[PDB]
C-alpha cells in the first residue's frame, strides 16, 4: 500500500503480539526499495526475531523431547517428523530474511552502521539455519554466517567506537557463533572479552542516546562470559 500505513499496521501487530503480521508489514515496507529508517529497521528486526524465535523454541522443545524418549515407541518417529516440520518453517523464515537482506537491505545503504547492522543480521539468520542444518547444507550455512559476521566485524572496528551498541551486539552474536555453531569456546570467551574490555577502556565514548544500550550489551557480554566459565 503506502509505507506510512504499513508501519502503523506493524506497530499495532507488535502490540497485539501478532508478529507474523508484523514481519509481513515490514517485509512489504522493505520490498518498496527505499532505505529503511532506524525505526523501520528496528521494527523489521524485532518482528523476524520473534517469528524465527518462536520456531527455534518449539524446535528446542521437540528436540528435548526426542533426547528423553527412553520409551522408544512410535513417539520417537513422530517427534522426528514434527521437528522436521518446524525445521522447514525455520528455513523458510530465514530464507525470507536473507532474501530481503541481499535483495534490498544490504545494497540500499553505504553507511557503516547500516552495513554492520545488516551484515550482522545476515550472520544471525545463517546462524539460525546452521542450528538445524546438516550435511552439505550446514557447511554452506556456517561459513556464510562467518563471512557475514567477519565483514561486519571489519567495518565495525574501522568506523565505530567499541561502545557503539551495534558494534557491541555484533561482538555478542559473533562470539555466540563461535561457541554454539563452531563449538569453539576459547574464541567465544576471547572475542567477548576483548569487545567488553575495549568498550570499558573507552567509556568516555558513551553517547547520550545509547549509553543504556551500550551498557546493556556490555552486561550481556559479561553474562555470556561467566555462564561459559
Amino acid at each position: 500500500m503506502d509505507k506510512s500505513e504499513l508501519v502503523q499496521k506493524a506497530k499495532l501487530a507488535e502490540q497485539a503480539e501478532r508478529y507474523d503480521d508484523m514481519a509481513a508489514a515490514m517485509k512489504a515496507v522493505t520490498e518498496q526499495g527505499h532505505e529503511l529508517s532506524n525505526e523501520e529497521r528496528n521494527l523489521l528486526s524485532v518482528a523476524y526475531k520473534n517469528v524465527v524465535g518462536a520456531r527455534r523454541s518449539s524446535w528446542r522443545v521437540i528436540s528435548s523431547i526426542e533426547q528423553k524418549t527412553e520409551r522408544n515407541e512410535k513417539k520417537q518417529q513422530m517427534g522426528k517428523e514434527y521437528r522436521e516440520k518446524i525445521e522447514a518453517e525455520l528455513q523458510d523464515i530465514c530464507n525470507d530474511v536473507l532474501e530481503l537482506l541481499d535483495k534490498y537491505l544490504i545494497p540500499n545503504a553505504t553507511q557503516p552502521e547500516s552495513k554492520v547492522f545488516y551484515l550482522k543480521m545476515k550472520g544471525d539468520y545463517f546462524r539460525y539455519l546452521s542450528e538445524v542444518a546438516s550435511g552439505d547444507n550446514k557447511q554452506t550455512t556456517v561459513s556464510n554466517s562467518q563471512q557475514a559476521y567477519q565483514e561486519a566485524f571489519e567495518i565495525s572496528k574501522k568506523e565505530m567506537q567499541p561502545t557503539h551498541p551495534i558494534r557491541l551486539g555484533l561482538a555478542l552474536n559473533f562470539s555466540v557463533f563461535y561457541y554454539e555453531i563452531l563449538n569453539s569456546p576459547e574464541k567465544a570467551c576471547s572475542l567477548a572479552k576483548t569487545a567488553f574490555d575495549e568498550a570499558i577502556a573507552e567509556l568516555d565514548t558513551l553517547n547520550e542516546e545509547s549509553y543504556k544500550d551500550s551498557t546493556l550489551i556490555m552486561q550481556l557480554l559479561r553474562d555470556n562470559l561467566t555462564l561459559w566459565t
Binding site: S64, Q67, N183, K212, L220, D223, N224, L227
Partner: peptide
C-alpha cells in the same frame, strides 16, 4: 532490562544442556 538479561541467560544456558 533485568528481564532481558534473564532471557539471554536462559536461552544461552540451553545449549550447554543439549551439548553435554
Amino acid at each position: 532490562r533485568d528481564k532481558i538479561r534473564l532471557n539471554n541467560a536462559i536461552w544461552r544456558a540451553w545449549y550447554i544442556q543439549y551439548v553435554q
